[PDB]
Amino acid sequence: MTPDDIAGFYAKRADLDLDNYIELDFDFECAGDPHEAAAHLCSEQSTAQWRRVGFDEDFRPRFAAKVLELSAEPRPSGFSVPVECAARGPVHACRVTIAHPHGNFGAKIPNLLSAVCGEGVFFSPGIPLIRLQDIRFPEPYLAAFDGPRFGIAGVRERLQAFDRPIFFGVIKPNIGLPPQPFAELGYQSWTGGLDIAKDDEMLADVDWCPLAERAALLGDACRRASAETGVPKIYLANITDEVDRLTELHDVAVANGAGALLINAMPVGLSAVRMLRKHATVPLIAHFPFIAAFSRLANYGIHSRVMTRLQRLAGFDVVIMPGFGPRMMTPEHEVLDCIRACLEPMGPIKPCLPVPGGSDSAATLENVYRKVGSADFGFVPGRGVFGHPMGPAAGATSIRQAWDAIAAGIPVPDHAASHPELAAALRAF
Amino acid sequence: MTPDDIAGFYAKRADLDLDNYIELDFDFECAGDPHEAAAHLCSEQSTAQWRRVGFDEDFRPRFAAKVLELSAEPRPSGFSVPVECAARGPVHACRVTIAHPHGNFGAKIPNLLSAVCGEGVFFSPGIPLIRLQDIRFPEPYLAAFDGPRFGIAGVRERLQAFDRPIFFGVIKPNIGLPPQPFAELGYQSWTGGLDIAKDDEMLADVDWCPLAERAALLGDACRRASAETGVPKIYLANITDEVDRLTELHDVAVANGAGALLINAMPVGLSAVRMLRKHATVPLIAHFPFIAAFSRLANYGIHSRVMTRLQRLAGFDVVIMPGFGPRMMTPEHEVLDCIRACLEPMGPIKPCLPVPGGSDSAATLENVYRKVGSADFGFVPGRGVFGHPMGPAAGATSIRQAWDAIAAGIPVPDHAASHPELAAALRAF
């Protein structure tokens, strides 16, 4: 890569059939020439070797990732965090858009990842810190996946929930409870006005609270509350387990009255999800364990937005992401980039429902709605429904009322002056 | 967690049946009391809520992760990297050992991860930066997995390779070559003295070089070279693909003479590997795309050693990790912690073979052997075999000779004075 091999790794937009390429945005820091560095980064990520021994061959035009656009400013301080490097001289901070020919891997999630962030990206020579900021896919490519089966669209219709956010609740306590008093809490929160009562991320099929039995009881409690309130209610059962057992658990949960399924997206593997999507009959919902390990630092890793794109692409109808509140340690606009990622038009792929976490209560709803900009989101209290002083039923109610205020454009604490549950929650949280 | 709920999340070694617990080592930074912080971290990771409404219940002793040991020193500077936080006052740097009751998830990889590094760990209140440094499992728990089928033990016997490192080679170029001139390069490198010729991480089943045909030709070239040298040779086929197609590709490759299979561990999902292990008939090898995104930074994420433990545990017989050389941007001792991780006695789980990456040639072999401490490792040149001036056959030879020197305790450049291939390689690299 030292000579004028560098030339063959750059291209103008105008010159490429952009339909054969996925666009990538990297921010990175490198030592020495930032032009060499970018080329090296395309090289490692794709060709790396374009001739054979002594052939004039160059299969760069058909197979090499190519720099579309590059931007680099000096930083005499050195790298952001201390690391250790294969180079000296100046250090630059860079922004690159690379066009990667997708014909290289075809339409499979595992192969995509291991190209756009395998060896190529992280062990490129002289580039210690690097962060993938976004992917863009062409229609032809997107057309190969199915994305969500339902989307916000579908989910809304299953709940008869229109022009208002979807109200989730994580039953608490979870870990430690046998299956019976579990249905109790769920039952109540639904009556109070919850749409969906969900299992905690860390609660699947275990000795002390088997899924077989949880779902049976919660399915009942669900059909019971649904009939008694006349509005459809939904039990969201966590079926996170070894990949082979995923299909088995889908059936067990659905047979027992589970309205939707929750999977821990990263731990099981996105490819796993895509396979369940082909078989699943109810909406699929992603939780966020693990994503944080590689998405938090601003100068390194992969932007959580990229994940969101992929989760949507893979088949999730709902994406639980980290939300607002300072207790969530994620930059404001970063969260919004994800909410955008979920809802953005994306070729034939349906928009999925974003669900910002954080310790939410009747008090924080007003805020989330302001910050989301519209009613197209989920809302997931834990305490604040099950933690409410008046009990779970009233905790749910408190949210419903908090909403009632916003939807009528009445500021919240005002409405709270005439509704005991909403007032209690404002006091408590 | 504000009151003396804190008490129930600490325990002395002496007090616990350590067999019910997995030990975890976290390094983190927190704001305000480090004692509250650690308790919160156990809480979030497990119980978080141990009563119901108004019951004296406390199911902390059976279900809550517990602080065995804690260590915390002040840092007036604030956090290492700039972040943003839910707290003020002093900032402390901490080291904790937490015992997590594994009865919480049972013996399943996805559930393990989503506890020991889901919400609990990364969104614990007032703890922005955190790194999982090590896991330790009890026999009872370990006994539930099978770990590697073959191990170094098995791999050594397949190759008749004893008392010397296993010599791998990544065929180059890869991306861009049709299947025919591929077999050519593989054939030669085996004849030169390579044990295993492998596909690049980024080369699976694609239009321009389908696995059906690669493996057919390379299987031939392998049987051919194996007969001609009288020593067993092996073709290592990459079968990275969508989870459901994994079983199909095992069969296609094995049927075609593939001696071992390579999977990209992270992109496919570790749960996926574990399922393949139940069905695979040849050794399994893990490559390292993606691990870097969450393991590089010293102050945040998950130490790659933890990954290695899990890969071994899942079923890999060989783990390709990032190696030495500065071009690899990983701390020396970190690489060694992984080499240790692979070989360490681990209950009924077999030791698997560690394979340090880096741009290795006949020149670096002497070094790796000194640094590994023994002959129990793989060695993976790319160029340096296929890049060698005299051609691939001679490139393989150069390594073989480099080894011959070491095994006789003759310093390398000395032996090179009488072997043209070793000399050329020393010049070239």
XYZ file of C-alpha atoms in Angstrom, chain A residues 40 43-53 57 59 62-63 81-86 103-111 113-115 117-120 122-130 145 172-178 181 185 200-208 238 240-245 264 266-272 274-275 278 287-297 299-302 307 320 322 326-332 383 386-387, chain B residues 40 43-53 57 59 62-63 81 83-86 100 103-111 113-115 117-130 145 172-178 181 185 201-208 238 240-245 264 266-272 274-275 278 287-297 299-302 307 320 322 326-332 383 386-387:
224
model
C -5.145 0.767 3.914
C -7.636 -2.638 1.501
C -7.726 -4.660 4.750
C -11.497 -4.606 4.711
C -11.717 -6.121 1.209
C -9.000 -6.924 -1.315
C -5.637 -6.342 0.456
C -4.182 -8.182 -2.508
C -5.387 -7.459 -6.021
C -2.869 -9.190 -8.349
C -1.406 -12.618 -8.371
C 2.405 -13.095 -8.392
C -4.954 -8.244 -12.968
C -9.546 -6.876 -9.267
C -15.040 -5.073 -8.842
C -14.057 -6.221 -5.339
C -7.128 7.823 25.030
C -3.659 6.364 25.599
C -3.056 3.269 23.417
C 0.033 1.852 21.646
C 0.920 2.085 17.973
C 2.718 0.708 14.893
C -21.347 -8.689 -3.852
C -18.444 -9.642 -1.584
C -20.669 -11.274 1.032
C -24.229 -11.313 -0.325
C -27.318 -10.813 1.852
C -26.276 -12.599 5.109
C -25.881 -10.858 8.488
C -22.790 -12.770 9.820
C -20.792 -12.150 6.625
C -20.482 -7.894 10.089
C -17.245 -9.793 9.571
C -16.469 -7.498 6.616
C -16.032 -4.641 11.263
C -13.680 -7.676 11.281
C -9.876 -7.624 11.069
C -9.982 -5.066 8.243
C -9.854 -2.760 13.827
C -6.318 -3.947 12.946
C -5.736 -1.742 9.960
C -2.120 -0.605 10.155
C -1.575 2.597 12.191
C -5.279 3.200 12.959
C -5.715 2.330 16.732
C -9.036 4.115 17.396
C -11.991 3.769 14.991
C -34.296 -9.222 3.789
C -41.190 -6.444 39.413
C -39.900 -8.253 41.331
C -38.992 -10.979 38.789
C -35.880 -12.980 39.690
C -36.902 -14.899 42.770
C -40.634 -15.140 42.304
C -42.343 -18.516 41.733
C -47.753 -14.348 42.379
C -48.966 -8.373 39.350
C -37.300 -9.041 32.637
C -34.322 -9.525 30.206
C -32.792 -12.006 32.640
C -35.845 -14.204 33.094
C -36.223 -17.173 30.740
C -36.792 -20.923 31.182
C -35.452 -21.911 34.623
C -36.029 -24.525 37.361
C -37.669 -22.068 39.799
C -38.823 -13.766 27.136
C -33.867 -16.124 25.266
C -32.086 -19.509 25.143
C -29.704 -21.684 23.066
C -30.422 -21.141 19.345
C -31.772 -24.650 18.680
C -34.345 -24.343 21.499
C -31.895 -10.546 23.786
C -26.836 -9.649 20.850
C -26.399 -12.739 23.111
C -28.440 -15.074 20.830
C -26.978 -13.611 17.597
C -28.770 -11.536 14.954
C -28.620 -14.423 12.500
C -30.592 -16.492 15.045
C -33.605 -13.785 11.334
C -34.256 -17.539 11.388
C -39.236 -17.062 9.247
C -33.875 -6.009 24.356
C -30.494 -4.254 24.619
C -28.145 -6.325 26.833
C -24.572 -6.245 25.544
C -24.838 -3.501 22.864
C -23.405 -0.991 25.440
C -20.016 -2.783 25.738
C -19.124 -1.659 22.180
C -21.313 1.420 21.616
C -20.722 3.711 24.631
C -17.323 5.320 23.967
C -14.104 7.658 19.923
C -14.197 3.837 19.530
C -16.384 0.938 18.441
C -19.749 0.922 16.686
C -27.142 -1.897 15.620
C -35.898 -1.526 23.262
C -31.381 2.898 26.227
C -29.077 10.793 33.287
C -29.272 7.370 34.972
C -28.872 5.987 31.404
C -25.446 7.474 30.603
C -26.122 7.882 26.824
C -25.800 11.205 24.917
C -29.199 12.789 24.142
C -40.869 0.867 39.340
C -44.920 -1.785 40.060
C -43.198 0.619 42.475
C -26.074 -1.338 43.116
C -28.542 -5.471 42.485
C -29.014 -4.407 38.823
C -27.271 -7.528 37.630
C -29.632 -9.822 39.549
C -32.393 -9.061 42.052
C -32.807 -5.250 42.103
C -36.013 -5.969 43.989
C -36.089 -8.547 46.701
C -39.436 -8.057 48.486
C -42.926 -7.745 47.225
C -45.062 -4.709 48.279
C -39.285 -11.899 51.966
C -34.805 -13.537 48.225
C -30.665 -17.362 47.032
C -30.821 -15.100 43.961
C -12.224 9.432 29.295
C -18.304 10.841 29.549
C -21.516 12.136 31.241
C -22.987 11.102 34.568
C -25.984 10.726 36.919
C -23.205 -14.475 40.766
C -29.029 -21.033 39.179
C -30.346 -17.694 37.833
C -29.776 -18.613 34.207
C -28.658 -22.270 34.098
C -26.082 -23.571 31.593
C -26.912 -21.542 28.452
C -24.530 -19.091 26.749
C -27.077 -16.365 25.720
C -28.546 -16.181 29.261
C -24.028 -13.068 28.771
C -27.264 -11.170 29.252
C -26.730 -11.336 33.028
C -23.076 -8.043 30.905
C -26.579 -6.807 30.151
C -28.391 -3.789 31.658
C -27.131 -4.616 35.126
C -23.470 -4.037 34.363
C -23.454 -1.103 31.886
C -26.353 1.039 33.136
C -25.719 0.607 36.803
C -26.381 3.962 38.437
C -23.349 6.273 38.686
C -20.922 3.734 37.116
C -20.164 5.024 33.552
C -16.975 3.094 32.841
C -16.715 -0.613 33.642
C -20.872 -27.933 28.620
C -3.385 -15.092 -0.583
C -4.789 -13.509 -2.599
C -8.309 -14.706 -1.684
C -11.061 -12.192 -2.391
C -11.181 -11.931 -6.166
C -9.810 -15.341 -7.152
C -12.015 -17.898 -8.945
C -5.839 -20.999 -9.108
C -1.459 -22.045 -4.034
C -12.153 -14.807 7.422
C -14.024 -12.931 4.684
C -14.335 -15.774 2.186
C -17.432 -18.011 2.436
C -20.123 -19.203 0.015
C -20.368 -16.610 -2.795
C -21.282 -16.369 -6.512
C -17.699 -15.902 -7.760
C -14.620 -21.103 6.227
C -19.482 -18.558 8.103
C -23.138 -18.020 7.071
C -26.712 -17.660 8.345
C -27.253 -19.961 11.367
C -29.722 -22.305 9.660
C -27.317 -22.913 6.741
C -16.310 -16.300 12.783
C -18.912 -13.324 17.239
C -20.899 -12.575 14.018
C -22.601 -16.037 13.985
C -23.219 -16.120 17.765
C -21.584 -18.378 20.331
C -24.873 -20.182 20.861
C -24.777 -21.094 17.143
C -22.419 -24.763 20.472
C -25.210 -26.213 18.298
C -23.277 -31.253 18.595
C -11.521 -16.469 14.018
C -11.509 -13.099 15.753
C -13.542 -10.582 13.734
C -15.527 -8.242 16.017
C -14.097 -9.141 19.446
C -11.824 -6.023 19.085
C -14.735 -3.522 19.110
C -15.437 -4.295 22.812
C -12.085 -5.584 24.086
C -9.427 -3.032 23.051
C -9.916 -0.103 25.509
C -10.879 1.106 30.967
C -14.092 -0.136 29.366
C -15.828 -3.241 27.970
C -14.859 -6.919 28.231
C -14.149 -14.248 25.258
C -7.227 -17.572 16.526
C -4.650 -11.222 17.825
C 3.144 -3.787 17.058
C 1.011 -3.924 13.909
C -1.507 -5.778 16.187
C -2.113 -2.963 18.702
C -2.808 -5.289 21.720
C -0.849 -5.166 25.032
C 1.722 -7.970 25.329
C 2.447 -13.010 3.336
C 2.392 -16.673 0.082
C 4.388 -13.462 -0.004
